[PDB]
Structure 1
């Protein structure tokens, strides 16, 4: 018996009996989650 993070796929199902899924997942996305002191002069160029 194999207890591992194995996805239930069509090719795997036909040859290996898969138990009930203990967790659900899917493809997701992620990204990378301080004004200057004299930032009040920003609207106009130096």
Structure 2
């Protein structure tokens, strides 16, 4: 993936939605987070007030 193309020289930088994890920090230099997120819930809002 994109982390592979940086350790193997096939790319100079990777700008994409890449999850900042520990296993990736040991091989790459991750910048500060430009977009905070987390696990959320998705439901179909009713639409049932017939």
Give yes or no for TM over 0.5.
yes
Give the strand-richer structure, 1 or 2: 2
State how many pairs are aligned. 34
Moved over 2 A (4+): none
Higher relative CO (Cα under 8 Å, sequence separation at least 6) belongs to 2
What is the root-mean-square deviation in Å for CA atoms of aligned residues? 0.5
Q: TM-score, normalised by structure 2?
A: 0.65
Consecutive unaligned residues of structure 1, counting only runs of 5 or more, are 35-46
Q: TM-score, normalised by structure 1?
A: 0.70
